[PDB]
Every structure is written in structure tokens, then in C-alpha cells.
Amino acid sequence: PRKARTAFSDHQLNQLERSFERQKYLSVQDRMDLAAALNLTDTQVKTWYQNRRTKWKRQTA
DNA sequence: CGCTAAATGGTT
DNA sequence: AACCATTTAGCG
């Protein structure tokens, strides 16, 4: 039992990256606001942010 | 294969 | 509950 891989829209990727350039971390309230704005789940936004921080560390190494 | 979403197991 | 480090795995 596995979740289908979300395919993010161009609009969703654009707004997640904008969120990340403004704030490396999100409060619970900012995370839930972002998910609602993008029509994603809280956990999909929490996962994108986590994986984005992993990417951020590798490309600043 | 590379990028990156989701899962695993640990940390805090 | 959320994050971290790493692994697993889907898709272009």
C-alpha cells in the first residue's frame, strides 16, 4: 500500500518555490493556508518543503 | 538515469 | 508533531 506520486501543476511548483524563497520553514497555520491556496493536502506541502530543504543543502554544499 | 515525491527509521 | 538523513520508487 503506497500513495500515488502527486504530479504538481506548473502553478503549484511556482507557488511552492515562491513560498520557499520567502521562508525556509512554515508554521502549521502557514502550511495549512498554502495547501488550501494550492488545493494540496497539508502532508503534500509538508513533504514538498522537507524534500526542498534536502535539495537546498546539496546545492549549497 | 536524474530529479523529486513518498517511505523508513531515527532524533528533537 | 515535525524535522532530519537516507532510501525507495514513479515518471519524463
Numbering used by the authors: 232 to 292
From the paper:
Transcription factors (TFs) recognize specific bases within their DNA-binding motifs, with each base contributing nearly independently to total binding energy. However, the energetic contributions of particular dinucleotides can deviate strongly from the additive approximation, indicating that some TFs can specifically recognize DNA dinucleotides. Here we solved high-resolution (<1 Å) structures of MYF5 and BARHL2 bound to DNAs containing sets of dinucleotides that have different affinities to the proteins. The dinucleotides were recognized either enthalpically, by an extensive water network that connects the adjacent bases to the TF, or entropically, by a hydrophobic patch that maintained interfacial water mobility.
To understand why both possible single base substitutions of AC that make it more similar to TT (AT and TC) lead to a decrease in affinity, we first investigated why DNAAT has a lower affinity to BARHL2 than both optimal sequences. The DNA recognition pattern in the BARHL2–DNAAT complex is more similar to DNAAC than DNATT. Compared to DNAAC, the hydrophobic contact between Thr285 and T18 opposite to A7 of AC is retained, but the extensive water network connecting both Thr285 and Thr278 with the AC region is almost completely lost. There is only one water molecule connecting the side-chain oxygen of Thr285 with the side-chain oxygen of Asn282 and one water molecule connecting Asn282 with N6 of A7 of AC. In addition, the side chain of Arg289 has only one conformation, rotated away from the protein–DNA interface.
